[PDB]
């Protein structure tokens, strides 16, 4: 909850937009993943969206699904992900950290217990990809009790009732209309439709969104430079600083 307010407020004073990169925890390896994350952070990432390898990525296409395969090949477990999250939080106190989850890994050993573990490690928000607003009640109530921001996706085929729900239920940011969202006082919208070029970040901000999220683009770079860990980071740094520059004023 807290960290998002602080970030968007600061970005606002700077007439700057937020750039949030997505990455799969443990891809291509745990050690390699921590390095990637630090590089993203210190390259200009305003927030982070991290996914934990799930056996059945429903709302995922090619690039992202392959990332999970790589994480699983490395034997990455949810337990190891939360250990990584604690370390990342220990190194970076203010950067908002969001999790992309699938309902089962949240529900597995108790929904509330999951959110407690999130708060304990310093996670700020959780977007459960396969839970529509119609089934979000126990997830959002638990997130709230633990000071976690429940993130909701606002699809292109969204209607008024949905807009109103996402507005009252969501916290932190709205995973993306823009004018209606602000009308209902929704959390700052962050566009996530295949954002892969600097021109797309500036366009997102210009349209009234508070920022943009780029996932596959980041994953591509990793998938592209597996055999060259150093070139992977180097290219990841260049990509991020370019995307961040495009949100800046």
């Amino acid at each position: 909850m807290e960290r998002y307010e602080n970030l968007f407020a600061q970005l606002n004073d700077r007439r700057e937009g937020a750039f949030v990169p997505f990455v799969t925890l443990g891809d291509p390896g745990i050690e390699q993943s921590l390095k990637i994350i630090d590089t993203l952070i210190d390259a200009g990432a305003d927030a982070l969206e991290l996914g934990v390898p799930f056996s059945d990525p429903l709302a995922n296409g090619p690039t992202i699904q392959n990332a999970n395969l790589r994480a699983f090949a490395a034997g990455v477990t949810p337990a190891q992900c939360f250990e990584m999250l604690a370390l990342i939080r220990e190194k970076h106190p203010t950067i908002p950290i969001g999790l992309l989850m699938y309902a089962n890994l949240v529900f597995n050993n108790g929904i509330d217990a999951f959110y407690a573990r999130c708060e304990q490690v310093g996670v700020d928000s959780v977007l459960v990809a396969d839970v529509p607003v119609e089934e979000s009640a126990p997830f959002r109530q638990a997130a709230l009790r633990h000071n976690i921001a429940p993130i909701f996706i606002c699809p292109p085929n969204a209607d008024d009732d949905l807009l109103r729900q996402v507005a009252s239920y969501g916290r932190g940011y709205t995973y993306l209309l823009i004018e209606k969202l602000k009308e209902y006082h929704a959390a700052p919208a962050l566009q996530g439709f295949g954002i892969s070029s600097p021109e797309q970040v500036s366009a997102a901000v210009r349209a009234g969104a508070a920022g943009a999220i780029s996932g596959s683009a980041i994953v591509k770079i990793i998938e592209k430079n597996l055999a060259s860990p150093k070139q992977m980071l180097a290219e990841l740094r260049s990509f991020v600083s370019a995307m961040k520059a495009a949100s800046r004023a």
Partner: protein, 389 residues
């Protein structure tokens, strides 16, 4: 929603927001369809004149000789396609047409659902694309060819993951953007609402016919109806009409595989734990930390890692009872039916018969009128059994 998405604590619609409109669209059409006499007449005509309903109810005297058990087999193996799958695939196809859709999207494992989607689509002028994983393809080559012959577009998916649940991801992803003109054809009484309800309603004729047929032959309802449970469609189809007949036992049979204790089985309802996946909250095969596991069974048609929401519910309240049958027990029931009645049962249905034989043999002097849902034929299994024997 217009109908309850839950069966107690089980069910729901755990899908990405983007897919909710498709689900609500389908639920609305289904409701209209059910109220529409013309839809019912068209659906009925197809089942009768195209698929071959009503299927027969065969009294098997030879196998129950010397015991007090009277066994009847609901002949779904005689249905066009050789399996009960056709009923609901025809219904869903008419439903897609009602919604003005021209495409059908499906995914397969055992091949039977892909072939079924293909026959219905070909028959009703629908463009059908079927997703299948490489590993699964090579094994089900005959069914792959069958699908192509029927004009179906078998799309080869291969990215590490190459199984039913793993191929569903691409089928759903497609539907997410194509739902305006395409209908995702789910093959069992599972997944997100309204699928568990639609599939049951489109399979319930099995039970309605059985009731009428049993009353005609015996003048009484059966003591129990037994059906194998892969995802739950043939089972719920048989159970449905008997649910309010409290005197009628409903027995669902899950695959025990190499034996429950070995872990290599496909019986999540009784030997798994509730989770959230496949767009539903239901018992499933999963690791301690929530990762979904694969089911095992000599019969591929029963390798679904979860079970329909309505079955998990029927169990919780004690209305239906579920048990398991090993590969070996299923193989024995298979051979026994062949030699004594001249009927080659599918390895799937053999689990249901194997249990009926157990009920009989353990208590030979117990008078009981049983009906086993013979969901399909085993012509496809002769090679498998052949290799084991």
């Amino acid at each position: 929603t217009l109908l309850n998405p839950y069966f107690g604590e089980f069910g729901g619609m755990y899908v990405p927001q983007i897919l909710m409109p498709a689900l609500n669209q389908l639920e609305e059409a289904f409701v209209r369809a059910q109220k529409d006499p013309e839809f019912q007449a068209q659906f009925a005509d197809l089942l009768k004149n195209y698929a071959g309903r009503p299927t027969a109810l065969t009294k098997c005297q030879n196998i129950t000789a010397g015991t007090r058990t009277t066994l009847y087999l609901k002949r779904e193996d005689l249905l066009h396609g050789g399996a009960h799958k056709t009923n609901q695939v025809l219904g869903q196809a008419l439903l897609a047409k009602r919604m003005g859709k021209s495409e059908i999207i499906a995914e397969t494992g055992a091949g039977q659902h892909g072939v079924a989607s293909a026959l219905a689509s070909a028959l009703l002028g629908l463009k059908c694309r079927i997703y299948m994983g490489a590993k699964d393809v090579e094994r089900q080559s005959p069914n792959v060819f069958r699908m192509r012959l029927m004009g179906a577009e078998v799309i080869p998916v291969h990215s590490g993951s190459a199984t039913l649940k793993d191929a569903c991801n691409e089928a759903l992803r497609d539907w997410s953007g194509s739902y305006e003109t395409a209908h995702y054809m789910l093959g069992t009484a599972a997944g997100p609402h309204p699928y568990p309800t639609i599939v049951r309603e489109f399979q319930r004729m099995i039970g309605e016919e059985t009731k009428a047929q049993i009353l005609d032959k015996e003048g009484r309802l059966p003591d129990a109806v037994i059906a194998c449970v892969g995802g739950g469609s043939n089972a719920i189809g048989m159970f449905a009409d008997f649910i309010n007949d409290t005197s009628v036992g409903l027995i669902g049979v899950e695959p025990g595989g190499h034996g429950i204790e070995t872990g290599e089985h496909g019986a999540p309802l009784k030997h798994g734990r509730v989770g959230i996946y496949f767009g539903m909250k239901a018992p499933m095969m999963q690791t301690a930390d929530g990762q979904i596991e694969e089911s095992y069974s000599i019969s591929a048609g029963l390798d679904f890692p979860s079970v329909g929401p309505q079955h998990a519910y029927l169990n919780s309240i004690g209305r239906a009872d579920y048990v398991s049958i090993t590969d070996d027990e299923a193989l024995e029931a298979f051979k026994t039916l062949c030699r004594h009645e001249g009927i080659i049962p599918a390895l799937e249905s053999s689990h249901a018969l194997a249990h009926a034989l157990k009920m009989m043999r353990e208590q030979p002097e117990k008078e009981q009128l049983l009906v086993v849902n013979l969901s399909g034929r085993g012509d496809k299994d002769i090679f498998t059994v052949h290799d084991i024997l």
